[PDB]
Amino acid sequence: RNAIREDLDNYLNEMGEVTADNIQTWLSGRILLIENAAQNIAINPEPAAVASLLEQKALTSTFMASYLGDATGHFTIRPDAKMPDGFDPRVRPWYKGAESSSTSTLTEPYIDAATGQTIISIATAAKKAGQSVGVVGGDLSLQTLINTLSARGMGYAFLVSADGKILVHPDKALVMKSLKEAYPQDTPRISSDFSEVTVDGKTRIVNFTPIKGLPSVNWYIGLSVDKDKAFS
Numbered sequence: 001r002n003a004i005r006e007d008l009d010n011y012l013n014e015m016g017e018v019t020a021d022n023i024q025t026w027l028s029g030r031i032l033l034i035e036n037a038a039q040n041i042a043i044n045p046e047p048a049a050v051a052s053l054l055e056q057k058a059l060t061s062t063f064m065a066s067y068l069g070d071a072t073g074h075f076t077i078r079p080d081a082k083m084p085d086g087f088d089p090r091v092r093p094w095y096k097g098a099e100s101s102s103t104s105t106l107t108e109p110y111i112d113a114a115t116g117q118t119i120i121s122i123a124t125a126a127k128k129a130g131q132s133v134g135v136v137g138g139d140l141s142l143q144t145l146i147n148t149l150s151a152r153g154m155g156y157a158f159l160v161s162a163d164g165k166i167l168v169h170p171d172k173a174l175v176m177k178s179l180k181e182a183y184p185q186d187t188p189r190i191s192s193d194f195s196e197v198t199v200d201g202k203t204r205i206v207n208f209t210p211i212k213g214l215p216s217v218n219w220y221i222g223l224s225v226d227k228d229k230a231f232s
């Protein structure tokens with residue numbers, strides 16, 4: 001094994017890059033739809049126009065919901081949903097995220113005010129010549145992200161922030177845990193090209209690949225493979 005080790009490294013690196021590239025491409029189109037909705041909203045922000053934009057099938061078929069929230073606390077959501085009493089878009093993570101960035105952004109997983117399930121959102125400020133008229137967002141379910149990741153018997157991919165927080169993992173118990181909390185006995189390190197760590201009495205090899213071309217966030221694909229199966 002100390003002969004083909006540099007070999008295995010090359011396969012694992014290649015698989016990480018491919019997986020990162022797929023997820024980037026999958027997210028990019030969705031990012032573009034939300035940006036386009038924001039650009040269009042900024043053309044005419046009257047609520048009738050906004051509603052009509054947000055009701056179109058390209059958006060409603062791609063996102064669980066798409067919406068605009070503004071600095072007065074008003075919001076429009078399509079498809080319409082009953083929101084909790086007192087719902088204020090200004091305090092929600094999609095809104096504060098977009099307001100803190102010069103470009104589009106993606107949230108970490110959070111609890112959806114609409115459905116009560118764990119989601120991420122894509123969001124961007126809708127600007128008319130330098131002035132923001134509000135924040136436009138769209139929601140994607142965790143289950144959707146988990147399925148996108150498990151699509152492509154050595155091992156599996158997961159998504160982790162560059163702060164070391166697991167964002168999306170096929171084991172749902174590890175969602176939104178730090179690497180340390182998720183792997184307490186022997187912790188993989190994003191600062192290492194490869195981490196050999198024992199899980200349930202087996203050696204796994206873990207590497208991390210940056211996902212290029214996302215706006216505002218720096219996230220990695222983690223790959224974890226059984227060390228015997230990989231060598232075999």
Ligand SMILES: CC(C)C[C@H](N)C(=O)O
Nearest residue numbers: 065067092112113114139
């Ligand atoms: C705007 C709404 C559809 C809900 C949004 N995802 C939230 O939790 O704030």
